[PDB]
Symmetry: C4
Subunit: 388 residues, 4 copies
């Protein structure tokens, strides 16, 4: 009907309640479920769906041997109904590619998939389910994107891309689209040294994305965008409570405009909600590998380089695997504020579970509450040995 | 369009005709059917669906070993099309939890799921498919609810919860919701000593729920609610025709405001239609275990402590298993009265059938007729030995 | 929108073209297809669907052993999309029973299912998907109905039932319904001695049903109904070209008001289009068993007891099995006349193919053309030995 | 709503981007996917679907042994959702036959299927999903059609048929339909000697179809139609860059009105976009067999018998199988021109891969871009040995 505008603010978060859960690997043991990875959730004005990058095979199927690789001609962006598994018979294909992003603007939805060789990949922008715009590689080394949903304000929806090295300086750019057409684009600015896999949300005409520095830096990069003026800035989260993985241990003071040193050439997609005292950071529990997941209330994290934990909540125990995590919100829900949500990818199989030749994932999703609810941990459930 | 109001009365019941049947366990032998339990039926203005608490696995699947437990992170409230099985590809998820209730109000539908540990569980109320309200545990010992549908009158829909011991005094409360928001709540009143798993229906601006006393008492508790004034009372069904399971034998006189003694720490979810001479009680045939099912016309049951059977009808033979049973009606059907219906859960597997490692169920459903129709028995059908 | 009226006449038939085909048994070898029997086709204002009486099991499933029986608590009336198989995931249940009929009236659809023991069965009438009317057994010996679709004229839809013996005198009645309510009913009249499984169609405010005499009589009974006056008559098709199965050989002259003698206690559901010179009778090729199928132009069959074949067309070869057959037409298609159609059930398995423990069927359907098209035979396709 | 008119022109093509991909054979290894062949794509005003001629069996199913044959009573025209596999549970049947074509006109869609024996086949035309017109064989030797979609202009949609010999002179005719009714038909004209499997598109009130000469001729026949006047002409593509398969090698000069000699009794369905300098021809890489696929910019191909390659792009490598290819466009997309698309069938199994007893295919589809995007090759993916 009409373009949506970020008119409200974030509700206060005093705890988190379960929103959705897949149980995909448990069910996939005896069903026609698709091997996926790199998921997310995204809302429309009438329903919210689950999203993922398919591998073009069922888990129990023979072609699942070798699904440890990321880029192939047999991947695609698919969507399915909330808390149901990525079934072969109930899934809908958005576009063909091995990297992606998607978002609705009040009128219709825009989806972007990237495909191709390393020497020269390319992005195609779709809108109202028709292919509208195309963009070829600029720095000729794996053109990539968010891996989670974008946000729009009155028709304009910014998106972040990177093209170039993963263990050194790259070429990041913020593009501004309106009905699938490029309005403008500008290169990265600010003090952030490496950008990758941005997780974004919005409130009161502003967009905040917490991203990943894969080069060096256990603290996380941040990008604030102004959808009306079409401008931005970047920096790091000051707080000493580090959130990348892998990472060293938490210190007494942190860094605001420089990567905190300790581990190289590695990271993980993550997110956070930056709102003064109402600030919460998410992270794995293990400093060495992707296991466990926890949420932490760290007042004034982004601006205070000494801030420490006030309250917290456990999502997945440290004996249980996790993976990626990102942000989303239901911009079309009734209320006076925006209720914040997030998802956590639960990876099974290789590399850590190598008696199996595949790699796949599960999903758990939570949203905020204004009460102080009790906590419980939410693992995937599957017994790898039933697959031997 | 507009809120629904309990404007009619109950039609006269002279017999029951089949409404719906699943045949889930028969079909699940060679299909992708989900292991479920604790079912019910619920109507919308345009279609009536089947409901159940999934276990997150298919019957023939490996993860079905151990589905004898009730509370787990892998259960969910699902719905599917009438007289079809709970298939993996045709099911819709309402919310995440191990206890529940749901009902439409004329405009939209409200669903409630409860999840968490025993020390501290919590309920989340959803409306129009978005999470609106949250409630944490009050007495810190398994917060639980109806296990069947609620009833609404002009926007207000009462719901009964219990939190605390199952073999002693607990904390029951009636909550009044309007569009997912808590209007009010009040503690139990009247002479009923223990409340659990209420089965409710409505006619002429009043709501009657026949429940379960798991502490002591083979006779059943009753709760009458006034949706307009937001008040209630409780008591027991006077009649000597006992209906809980397990239970002792029928006596000559019964108890109106006190639990009839005989068996402890056990019961089963049940229901009844209380309407003077037009009164019918349902019950298993075996006094010791959940087998067989029969309907009995006992005039003035609730107020007469000597009332005895006038007419009856067999639903499931005593050589056949049954389980839970509850009430529902199609508030949007054409006519001058409300045609009363009920469902019976048919459990297969453990505990009684232990050559199998799972536990699942089937459904049969009937509604009333004004004629005196012939009777037939309706078992599940499956041969356990085809699963060995 | 508005009630439909039989306003047109039959187009001239000069040949038949394929309309639809299932290929169910071929596909069911490696799919979740349901064991069915007693099928038919029925149109709505917007789509035409396939219909059948399910057995509550998949073909490859264990519970298919013993599906040679007809009456059981696990059967149901289901419908699915045209030329697709009766799949477990794509089927819709109309009502519970082992005998049936259904038809749309311009506004909504009425469906009727019969269930129960032999001593006392009962029919429930549904309308707009809600159970409206009930009727108990009158002569206490297997109450049964059409096994194909009914026809309506301005809201009124007659239906034929039988209750009593199959090898002697019974109790037939024509019921007249309007929105699921009984308008009237009257007993059989005319010179027909035994009625069973009527196949009906309509044009110019009249309804003709060709039925089955299971007692004695290789020639077929006929019932003409006047939907406006609510009256009828019966008789036999005069022509010497006999069409029941089993049957003796064709003679030189036939019988108009008396069963032609030759074979007892046996028959098969069939049909015909009676329209003067534009008359066509259908029948199996073998006089002893259900094999092959052919259509024959026999001018003035119903009134001329000497009429013989003018033109013909082969549908299924005599080396291929067939079974039941019935009539249907698309009352909502554009044109100035009614294009006539029919279906043939193709049975596989027991009794003739006994290396398998089940019994199931396939469907082929044809409609008329005004040209003289070429012919081809349409078998089921499946190789029974792939099931061993 | 209203009839569609070819009002725009072709956008300029500077490269091709992926549109859709099936991955059917990879997935069919562990799923209920249907054995198909002879596919295509076709758009509606609201969605574009995939099309194919089914064989009436699943790939892993027993009835897949022998699917090397083309004409049988068990084939059908089916359609399914874009980039999803032809699943047994998600497919929709259009009509019954072993040869076909289909297209939407702005209001509704017309589909045509051909069935029957070689002595006398026949076509039935369907519209708005009801059978409207019938046509019997004229030259009594396999009546056949396009095997891809038709194009319409203000209600009129021409279609090309052939009936008669494949290795000598036949009887081709162009039919003009309007709402399923034959407006007119006329025999082939111009200098083309043999016509088969036409691939058509349209822009600015004209229809161009590049077809197949199976008799003699490695260069391709062309038919230009005037939808308003209902007339046409034929000829060959002049250019020396030959595109049929099998074929001899490319010469220095070509033939405009005569079949270029070299190989007999063989060909393959193909297409091309003829637009002056903006001209592109598609073809397999191997001159002997169906392997590899490439697109070539050959300015003024149709009129210049010396034209040679200016630019090109690889679609499938020569070590990978291909098959048929055809044209389609989204006539209802926003813009000022028509964005051109095409599909390539990827055949697996017999005849070249004979360790398997079946024959099936996969799909890849691309559309044009105005940028110069990078290229990648798109194979089917499946490992035949996982089927042994
Ligand atoms: C039934 O259910 C109810 C329902 O909620 C349960 O109640 C909840 O219990 C939670 C667990 O205790 C609790 O969460 C914790 O909150 C802390 C903050 O509170 C305290 O301090 C503030 C300020 O002084 C006070 O206001 C407050 O009242 C308290 O005093 C957090 O600090 C906790 O986090 C730390 O511990 C966990 C492990 O338990 C770590 O994973 C986490 O990362 C935190 O510790 C690391 O990080 C800090 C920051 O740099 C380091 O200083 C510290 O050394 C740790 O560092 C190591 O670990 C990380 C990760 O391994 C690594 O990178 C680093 O290098 C180091 O190696 C925790 O989040 C809830 O707040 C509580 N509910 C409420 C409402 O408060 C109830 O318990 C159940 N049972 C019953 C009977 O009810
Ligand atoms: C073809 O189909 C037709 C279609 O309907 C068939 O007709 C139907 O047949 C039914 C079965 O007989 C019948 O149902 C019974 O009705 C009784 C009431 O009728 C009589 O009394 C009244 C008042 O005097 C009269 O008006 C009426 O005319 C009759 O005289 C019920 O009382 C029957 O229930 C009792 O028996 C069944 C077992 O058969 C028990 O399961 C049931 O619980 C009842 O008995 C227990 O409970 C009472 C109450 O406390 C006890 O006193 C008694 O001792 C039993 O107690 C033991 O059992 C329970 C459970 O095991 C346990 O807790 C307790 O401790 C004890 O151990 C029964 O319901 C229908 O009414 C009839 N149709 C109609 C319209 O009436 C037809 O038969 C078929 N065949 C043919 C040829 O047509
Ligand atoms: C390529 O395709 C084209 C496309 O159509 C093919 O053309 C079609 O060919 C059909 C087969 O021959 C033909 O159908 C037949 O039509 C007969 C009527 O025509 C003749 O008579 C009339 C009047 O005199 C003339 O107008 C007309 O021109 C002809 O002369 C029917 O009579 C045929 O039916 C009989 O034979 C078949 C077997 O072939 C039986 O199954 C059938 O039941 C009929 O025979 C039995 O019944 C009669 C009636 O009582 C008995 O008298 C007779 O003895 C038989 O009885 C025994 O059998 C039954 C069943 O087994 C049992 O109950 C009984 O007791 C006995 O034991 C037949 O229907 C089409 O009409 C023709 N197309 C057209 C438009 O006409 C073409 O051939 C193909 N090839 C080529 C090169 O084109
Ligand atoms: C990273 O990705 C980027 C993204 O695009 C890559 O860039 C692209 O590279 C493509 C491959 O080289 C290239 O396509 C070729 O274009 C030729 C035309 O260009 C040249 O000539 C014109 C005019 O002079 C100039 O304007 C232009 O600048 C060039 O000089 C085509 O001619 C090419 O086709 C021929 O070769 C291929 C094999 O490679 C054959 O399959 C094809 O059929 C052509 O050759 C046959 O046909 C001709 C015509 O009759 C014959 O003369 C010739 O002998 C061949 O004949 C045999 O073969 C056929 C089939 O086997 C048989 O029937 C016959 O009998 C003979 O036996 C080719 O299409 C793209 O144009 C280029 N992109 C752009 C925008 O240009 C990049 O490379 C990647 N890497 C990096 C680092 O970036
Ligand atoms: C487009 C692409 O290749 N994305 C891949 C990125 C990429 O390698 C890093 O961002 C380094 O640049 O890594 C992740 P992970 O395996 O670390 O879990 C897998 C992704 O699929
Ligand atoms: C929330 C919960 O645990 N519900 C469980 C209740 C509960 O134990 C009783 O109401 C005693 O309080 O019992 C039944 P049942 O096994 O007796 O058939 C299983 C339920 O799932
Ligand atoms: C309601 C019912 O039992 N219908 C059955 C009738 C019935 O026995 C005959 O009409 C004799 O009355 O026969 C057929 P068929 O086996 O002969 O092919 C099977 C039906 O299912
Ligand atoms: C109606 C029909 O039979 N179509 C068949 C045609 C036909 O034989 C040729 O057009 C020669 O006339 O060939 C193809 P292909 O096998 O060559 O790949 C298979 C088709 O199914
Ligand atoms: C998977 O492939 C590897 C080589 O990639 C092979 O050695 C291994 O045995 C395969 N796994 C299975 C289960 O076949
Ligand atoms: C189920 O698990 C138990 C232990 O919980 C084990 O002893 C048993 O053998 C398992 N059943 C099957 C069929 O594997
Ligand atoms: C059918 O006839 C009645 C009068 O006989 C009329 O009201 C009705 O509208 C007619 N049907 C249609 C479709 O108009
Ligand atoms: C089917 O059941 C019969 C008895 O009804 C039994 O003898 C037979 O062996 C069973 N068939 C199969 C395939 O198990
Ligand atoms: C397929 O059929 C042929 C004969 O057509 C037979 O020889 C062959 O063994 C069959 N293939 C399989 C896998 O059974
Ligand atoms: Ca890092
Ligand atoms: Ca009790
Ligand atoms: Ca007979
Ligand atoms: Ca050729």
């Amino acid at each position: 009907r009409d373009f949506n505008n970020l008119t409200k603010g974030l509700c206060t978060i005093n705890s988190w309640h379960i929103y959705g859960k897949d149980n995909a690997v448990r069910i996939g043991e005896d069903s026609d479920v698709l091997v996926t990875r790199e998921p997310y959730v995204s809302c429309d004005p009438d329903e919210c769906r689950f999203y993922a990058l398919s591998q073009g095979t069922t888990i129990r199927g023979k072609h699942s041997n070798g699904t440890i690789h990321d880029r192939s001609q047999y991947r695609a962006l698919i969507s399915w109904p909330l808390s149901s598994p990525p079934t072969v018979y109930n899934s809908r294909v958005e576009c063909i590619g091995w990297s992606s992003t998607s978002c609705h603007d009040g009128k219709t939805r825009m989806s972007i998939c990237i495909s191709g060789p390393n020497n020269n990949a390319s992005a195609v922008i779709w809108y109202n389910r028709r292919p509208v715009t195309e963009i070829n590689t600029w720095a000729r080394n794996i053109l990539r994107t968010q891996e989670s949903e974008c946000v729009c304000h009155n028709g304009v929806c910014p998106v972040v891309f990177t093209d170039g090295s993963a263990t050194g300086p790259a070429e990041t750019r913020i593009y501004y689209f309106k009905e699938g057409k490029i309005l403008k684009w500008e290169p990265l600015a600010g003090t952030a040294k490496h950008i990758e896999e941005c997780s974004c949300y919005g409130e009161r005409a502003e967009i905040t994305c917490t991203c990943r520095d894969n080069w060096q830096g256990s603290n996380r990069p941040v990008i604030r965008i102004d959808p009306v003026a079409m401008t931005h800035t970047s920096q790091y989260i000051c707080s000493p409570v580090l959130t990348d993985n892998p990472r060293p241990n938490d210190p007494t003071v942190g860094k605001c405009n420089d990567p905190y040193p300790g581990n190289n050439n590695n990271g993980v997609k993550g997110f956070s909600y930056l709102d003064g005292v109402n600030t919460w950071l998410g992270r794995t529990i293990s400093i060495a590998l992707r296991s466990g997941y926890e949420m932490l209330k760290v007042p004034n994290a982004l601006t205070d380089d000494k801030s420490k934990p006030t309250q917290g909540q456990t999502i997945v125990l440290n004996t249980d695997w996790s993976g990626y995590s990102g942000s989303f919100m239901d911009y079309w829900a009734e209320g006076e504020c925006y209720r914040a949500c997030f998802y956590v990818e639960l990876i099974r199989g290789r590399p850590k579970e190598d008696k199996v030749w595949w790699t796949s994932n599960s999903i758990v999703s939570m949203c905020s509450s204004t009460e102080f609810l009790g906590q419980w941990d939410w693992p995937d459930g599957a017994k790898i040995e039933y697959f031997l």
